[PDB]
């Protein structure tokens, strides 16, 4: 009765699926993905934080971010109906290029990645698990898109390995730097035999850039992969870096403000939606945290300004 | 209540594939879902279809699409089915503007008739046999039958006119098996000519050609195949050929020995009085039909979800008893 997705997706005739409409028994292009998350392997404190984190995602809308169409809750499991790509992930593509992509082609992929996270960070959305495996091809459209937002050692910023309190936007900037490296060398920037030996390198932040990599692009990598989260680069620097120039709007939250009746409506709709206790919402917004509340606030803020500009 | 409704009928989008992905690319682990609309259906249609679809779950044959699950809801009915890679047969035949080579027709046709042979012995008729309902599992070498004509339909009349028997165009009572036979003859004809045997500009004159049963076979088709076709395409259903004859026509024989595998025991093993009664009692308890209903259907020798559910439950009893042997 209430385990119908369960018998479809987990039954004996067989967690990421494609649902594709058939025509005379062959695939068409009407398709969505479905991701199945195992609630059981998680606590009710953690399972409560997962559902708020993914509900928030339905509000993200960007060409280079994979849309979350629905979340369907179950006792035992959670189902995400997602946009479905065409040519696999960006990690297998790099495996097909053992010494790197040509820089002009790299630029085209990385600009899209950076444009995506740059949009996220202006809306207080933050990926936390940024890997080439989470960059996905939409080949028929000529796009890459980020998927599988957060909530394995190479991609982790070295502060994450220390366990100390993090500034979440800077960890994405690091994970951005590991991605640039892998595009232009076809190898991860920190890889030794022992998982332990590796860890030292990442803490040290000692990597070699191959000689064929241009002077500009070498500089961009050192601006994102520095041992200290405070010295890394904000996105306006990366977005406008020389290396990315030439490669061809921006979120309204960045340069316009809410009216006070507009601001109050959001916080009212947020509490009525059981997003959080109003006190927590204002601590969050004032602390300027990077979590599903601020994100919810700022995505909803953007939908009102977008409507206000349309009327004009 | 509506979780499936949102998956398949949601804004992001009835026959779908559900396919396992691995690093965001398709695999071969896949099933299919056919969605059936129960609205615009009375209560007795909705009741039977639920048992027909329910009894198709018991059919097992290499040449029939497996019906793994049924999932009933208020509006829609969801059939979890076996998914092919290959397309259907009509698109295959259409690619062959002058028919398939006769020894390839033979390979496909022999498979189709083993499917219909297994069905008719277990008192299952297709009622909608046409090359669109023959699917390719070309990774496994074979074709399987699908979309059995269930109570939703009883493909529309403008389209299915070509494939329809004269007696179901005239509209009177009929032997349902003989209708599948007529449909076998039309398929064989398409396999070896890439054209349907009755087709005209007006769909009113096609109707006449079917009633009079006039068609012409290209010269290159052998005399035996030609003969098989005329034994399945008679206007009188009493004149057509039962599956023993068809399945043993020289065109498909050629004298190798026959495998007992994939043949229903119900056709040669007999049942005891206590077992016969044990089925009907399980059927009455399972609320499939009145005991009168069941005894009447078996006495009249009908082909529907009662007699079929009877010979399927029977075959299980025969298969387990044979296992003990």
Curated annotation (Swiss-Prot), chain B:
Catalytic residues of the enzyme: 128 (proton acceptor)
GO biological process: myeloid cell differentiation; protein phosphorylation
Location of the Protein kinase domain: 14-252
Domain UBA: 272-315
MF (Gene Ontology): ATP binding; magnesium ion binding; protein serine kinase activity; protein serine/threonine kinase activity
Amino-acid positions noted as binding ATP in the UniProt annotation, renumbered to this chain: 14-19, 34
Covalent S-S links between cysteines: none
Main location, first listed in the record: nucleus
Keyword line: ATP-binding, Kinase, Magnesium, Metal-binding, Methylation, Nucleotide-binding, Nucleus, Phosphoprotein, Serine/threonine-protein kinase, Transferase
Phosphothreonine modifications at: 156
Subcellular location per the Swiss-Prot or TrEMBL entry: Nucleus
Post-translational modification: Autophosphorylated. Phosphorylation on Thr-156 by STK11/LKB1 in complex with STE20-related adapter-alpha (STRADA) pseudo kinase and CAB39.
Modified residues (Phosphoserine): 151
GO CC field: nucleus
Tissues of expression: Expressed in hematopoietic progenitor cells and leukemic cell lines. Weakly expressed in the testis.
Primary role: May play a role in hematopoietic cell proliferation or differentiation. Potential mediator of neuronal apoptosis.
Family, similarity comment: Belongs to the protein kinase superfamily. CAMK Ser/Thr protein kinase family.
Entry protein name: SNF-related serine/threonine-protein kinase
Full protein segment contained here: 1 to 344 of 765
């Amino acid at each position: 009765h209430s385990q119908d997705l369960e018998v479809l997706f987990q039954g004996p005739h067989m967690g990421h699926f494609a649902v594709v409409k058939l025509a005379r028994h062959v695939f068409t292009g009407e398709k969505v993905a479905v991701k199945v998350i195992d609630k059981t392997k998680l606590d009710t404190l953690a399972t409560g934080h997962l559902f708020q984190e993914v509900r928030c995602m339905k509000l993200v809308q960007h060409p280079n971010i994979v849309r979350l169409y629905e979340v369907i809750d179950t006792q035992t499991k959670l189902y995400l109906i997602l946009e479905l790509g065409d040519g696999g992930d960006m990690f297998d593509y790099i495996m097909k290029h053992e010494e790197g992509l040509n820089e002009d082609l790299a630029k085209k992929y990385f600009a899209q990645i950076v444009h995506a996270i740059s949009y996220c960070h202006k809306l207080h959305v933050v990926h936390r698990d940024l890997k080439p495996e989470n960059v996905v091809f939409f080949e028929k459209q000529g796009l890459v898109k980020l998927t599988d937002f957060g909530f394995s050692l190479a991609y982790s910023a070295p502060e994450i390995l220390l366990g100390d309190e993090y500034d979440a936007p800077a960890v994405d900037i690091w994970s951005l730097g590991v991605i640039l490296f892998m595009l232009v060398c076809g190898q991860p920037p920190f890889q030794e035999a022992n998982d332990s030996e590796t860890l030292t390198m990442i803490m040290d932040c000692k990597y070699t850039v191959p000689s064929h990599v241009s002077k500009e692009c070498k500089d961009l990598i050192t601006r994102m992969l520095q041992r200290d989260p405070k010295r890394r680069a904000s996105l306006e620097e990366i977005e406008n870096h020389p290396w990315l120039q030439g490669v061809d709007n921006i979120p309204l939250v960045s340069y316009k403000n809410l009216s006070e009746e507009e601001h109050n409506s959001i916080i009212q709709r947020m509490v009525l939606g059981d997003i959080a206790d109003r006190d927590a919402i204002v601590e969050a917004l004032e602390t300027n945290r990077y979590n599903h509340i601020t994100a919810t606030y700022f995505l909803l803020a953007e939908r009102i300004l977008r409507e206000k500009q349309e009327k004009e």
